[PDB]
């Protein structure tokens, strides 16, 4: 069961925060090698000097690909699985899968890195956002009561009516920098940046396609008239 996330690719601030998160917490193991710092800065509206100073940690040039020092073979040996390139991961898995996966890490002592993932069971990835999210465990917490889709909210306060459930992801209190909403926004910005990286031509594609479709409707009108006429 995945969680839906509404990703706004026109939000430059969110994409900038996601790029910062990717460059700091993700490019340690994951490359974005099919994507250049120059294009990322141009599309996110980041000044080239600012991109150089804030997001390029590897000594690469602005026009260089987002390569990292960790080789796939070395990382496969170290982690048991090679950390895949994340340029297209939004297209490979989808944004909802990424949103649910980056928020589904929970402590699991039986695992090599002490964590497991609801979305990606037995994943070889360490929980690298634990400092932000905090300790997440499979425990008992309050979950909204649902009966055959009959979802109960509080009529007055508008907040959910909840009952206790003991197989839920619960963040141990005062264990991470960000609360649930703040970590949700952090993961949303990161997944928004990954969605941009997978499909950097999306907005331009929509604009160009709108113009193309308008032209094709015009041309269709003319061709239809030239056909129906001349078929009399």
């Amino acid at each position: 069961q995945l969680d839906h996330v509404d990703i706004d690719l026109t939000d430059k601030a969110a994409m900038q925060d996601g790029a910062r998160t990717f460059a700091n917490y993700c490019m340690g193991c994951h490359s974005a090698k099919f994507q250049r710092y120059e294009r990322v800065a141009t599309d996110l509206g980041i000044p080239a000097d600012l991109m150089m100073e804030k997001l390029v940690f590897t000594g690469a040039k602005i026009g260089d690909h987002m390569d990292i020092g960790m080789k796939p073979a070395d990382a496969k040996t170290w982690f048991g699985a090679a950390p895949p390139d994340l340029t297209l991961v939004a297209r490979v898995r989808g944004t909802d899968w990424l949103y649910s996966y980056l928020r589904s890490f929970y402590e699991d002592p039986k695992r090599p890195w002490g964590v497991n993932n609801v979305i990606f069971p037995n994943v070889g990835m360490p929980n690298v956002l634990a400092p932000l999210q905090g300790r997440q465990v499979i425990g008992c917490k309050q979950v909204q009561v649902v009966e055959d889709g009959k979802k109960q909210f509080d009529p007055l306060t508008g907040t959910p009516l909840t009952h206790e459930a003991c197989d839920q992801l619960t963040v141990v209190p005062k264990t991470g920098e960000l609360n649930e909403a703040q970590f949700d926004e952090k993961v949303k910005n990161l997944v928004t940046f990954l969605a941009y990286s997978a499909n950097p031509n999306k907005l331009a594609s929509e604009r160009i396609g709108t113009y193309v479709l308008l032209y094709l409707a015009f041309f269709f009108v003319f061709a239809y008239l030239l056909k129906r006429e001349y078929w009399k």
């Binding site: 900038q16 925060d17 910062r20 980041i46 600012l50 991109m51 804030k54 997001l55 940690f57």
Partner: peptide, 16 residues
């Protein structure tokens, strides 16, 4: 605004 948004996570305390 962008610079604050893009601040690196790792902070290093330096002499002087």
């Amino acid at each position: 605004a962008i610079a604050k948004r893009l601040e690196p996570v790792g902070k290093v305390c330096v002499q002087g």
